[PDB]
Amino acid sequence: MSPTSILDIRQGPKEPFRDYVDRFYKTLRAEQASQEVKNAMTETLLVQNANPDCKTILKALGPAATLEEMMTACQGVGGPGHKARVL
Incomplete structure (x- = not known):
């Protein structure tokens, strides 16, 4: 709860995007609360809830x-990607 910060819960969150991102930004938000597009600069490796594009892709x-x-390219993607099964 209180003794609980990203860089101590940091297990290695490569793939559980929404499931962990809401939790990540909920603590981390002293440095980049605003979902600011430059979110490829801190320990940020995801985006709050994210969209169905990014989710389905970075999952692998x-x-x-x-x-x-x-992490952020999904915001301007204009389409569903091109990967009929994940692997």
Whole structure:
């Protein structure tokens, strides 16, 4: 509850996007509350609730680099992606 911060609950949240993001930003929000588009600069690795695009993609697309674009690229995506099954 109170002795409970992102960088101590940081397990390694690569893939449980919404399930963990709401929890992450709920504590982390002293530094970047505003869902600010530059969210590829702090320990932020996701976006509050996110959209169905980003969710379905980064669920497999956590290769420790390309996430930093994918985190927020979903905001301007204009479509459902191109991946008929995740792997």
